[PDB]
């Protein structure tokens, strides 16, 4: 059976929600950051960068949360919703917004996450200028989304996909523990899109089980 | 008919080398980054984040360099080398190392690119601490690569793929204009791997046509 490392962190939830959307069986295995488990040889043999998630599916090993998403959506393509779209062009749009999430959307949001949610618990001083910069930067990204989502129901078109799902875990933080829900709520089309994808049963189940 | 925007810059070269590898016919359209062409209404209708590349293919538009790679490799899958691998498991490994390049390899290398090659665009005084941090970070990533590449000929297995090619444009800066070639040279397997992918005819052609 397929196994996922680190379900309680945000990044692996990109993979968990995809597994649940596709109706795939899996088990999860915790990783104790506090005891440095992710920096010890056993976990490094799965994920050599020492970050989560890591996924082992029988003889097969794969890491990077969005790579895992793609692997699952391709392998189990014919069940559940098609999170890759139907055509090469559809899939191109999914990949495009998957890469926007990885390279443009996530990095400032990760900064807000580290400095607002884990400054205290990890023992880092909260970087107040970086917080202001990261928010301004994320707000510009969200303005682009707002325009796009007024002409398109989901990021890659009229169908929900991996690109939408990739936004769930850290945006859950943004509207929650990070305390900046207004960044989503104040943008009509972004806000309705968030209401849509974040109330899907697969995401609700992920959150009930792995928060 | 397929058109690539901003060929003289590094990120678009990811798309070009994939196009050339696949033997696809294309044209290029210059974008003047210095005068802010990429931040004006004409280019923003193509790429709403105002960066290059953007690709227009008949009725179809797509941006993000690695998405363009995936799109080209899939649309033309049945010609040239298969840069996506053969199986779902192979493609999984390609996607893994493509995402390592996007999220782990590239960010510190981009910081080195900006702050050393384009110092004036980042402003003065030069951020020497961020430069030192970026080099340390990239060196850590390169150590993982060295270990991995001692057990695997290319990143995703025994076949060259998008994941390897995605490394060409900025690593070319690293060993050249950035002036930190030892980061590759001092790592035996990384160095031999680099010698291999950067001597491919498609990469040689990309560089011959689109540098200045
Ligand atoms: N968004 C960031 C980095 C992207 C960038 O500009 N990259 C290079 C092109 S790499 O081949 C660049 O600075 N070009 C500027 C120029 O030549 O005018 C910034 O500019 O502040
Ligand atoms: N994630 C994007 C990044 C593209 C990118 O940053 N391109 C650079 C040139 S290499 C650019 O357009 N810089 C202009 C700017 O950001 O102002 C991709 O890979 O396509
Ligand atoms: Br965990
Ligand atoms: Br150009």
Curated annotation (Swiss-Prot), chain B:
Segments forming domain GST C-terminal: 87-212
Residue(s) carrying Methionine sulfoxide: 34, 117, 122, 183
GO cellular component terms, semicolon-separated: apoplast; chloroplast; chloroplast stroma; cytoplasm; cytosol; peroxisome; plant-type vacuole; plasma membrane
Induction: By zinc in roots and benoxacor.
PTM comment text: Oxidated at Met-34, Met-117, Met-122 and Met-183 in oxidative stress conditions (e.g. hydrogen peroxide H(2)O(2)).
Activity regulation note: Redox-regulated enzyme; in oxidative stress conditions methionine oxidation ensure a thermodynamic and structural compensatory mechanism to guarantee H(2)O(2) peroxidase activity despite transferase activity inhibition.
Alphabetically ordered keywords of this record: Cytoplasm, Detoxification, Oxidation, Oxidoreductase, Peroxidase, Phosphoprotein, Stress response, Transferase
Modified residues (Phosphoserine): 11
Catalytic activity, as annotated: RX + glutathione = an S-substituted glutathione + a halide anion + H(+)
Keyword Membrane recorded: no
Binding annotation for glutathione: 10-11, 38-39, 51-52, 64-65
Entry-linked PROSITE patterns: GST_CTER (PS50405), GST_NTER (PS50404)
Entry function: In vitro, possesses glutathione S-transferase activity toward 1-chloro-2,4-dinitrobenzene (CDNB) and benzyl isothiocyanate (BITC), and glutathione peroxidase activity toward cumene hydroperoxide and linoleic acid-13-hydroperoxide. May be involved in the conjugation of reduced glutathione to a wide number of exogenous and endogenous hydrophobic electrophiles and have a detoxification role against certain herbicides.
The protein's name in its UniProt record: Glutathione S-transferase F9
